[PDB]
């Protein structure tokens, strides 16, 4: 994609959005808070394979370790949602509580992500339900009664 999201960029976004490590609040950044953040992101993405479903995350192949310089594989349309969810999960490390505006932003981004993965399964006919004489089950098609399976 456009510039390719790395796993370190997402955790830096989350750290910046609450004024923990950025150049436009005071100063500073730590190296352990990065490994902790990246591991938290990996575990979150593992969990998301259940409720929100797969979104294309690129996991580490074999054991090794994630490393912040690895390519995430996510489209750029998801970074705000992922970053806000990660910030919500990792706020309590520093003993902080989110403000209402942060919660509102997180909910809006999550809703945008949810809208892009809908299915609406569209239930089918049963299998003992007849198909009428009107569509000529003898000659044109075969098998009067719907299959309703496959």
């Amino acid at each position: 994609m456009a510039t390719v999201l790395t796993k370190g960029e997402i955790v830096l976004f989350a750290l910046r959005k609450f004024a923990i490590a950025s150049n436009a609040s005071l100063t500073d950044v730590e190296p352990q808070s990065i490994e902790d953040g990246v591991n938290d992101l990996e575990d979150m993405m593992s969990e998301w394979m259940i409720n929100p479903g797969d979104i294309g995350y690129a996991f580490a192949t074999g054991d090794e370790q994630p490393l912040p310089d690895d390519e995430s594989g996510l489209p750029r349309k998801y970074k705000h949602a992922v970053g806000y969810q990660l910030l919500l999960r990792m706020l309590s490390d520093y003993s902080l509580e989110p403000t209402p505006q942060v919660l509102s932003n997180a909910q809006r981004s999550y809703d945008a992500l949810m809208t892009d993965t809908l299915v609406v399964p569209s239930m089918r006919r049963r299998g003992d339900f007849p198909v009428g004489q009107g569509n000529k089950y003898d000659v044109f098609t075969s098998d009067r009664y719907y299959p309703g399976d496959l």
Binding site: P130, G132, Q133, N135
Partner: protein
Amino acid sequence: TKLDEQFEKYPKFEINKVATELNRIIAEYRNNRITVKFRPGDREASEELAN
């Protein structure tokens, strides 16, 4: 419609209710069939001619 990458077709039931009166009309004629007659005239020999 497609219906999740398939082509299920709409059920089309047929309940024929317009043929009963038509059958009644056709039975009415097949009961009384009618044909040509060749009526006679006013003449000495037209009776045998018509017969």
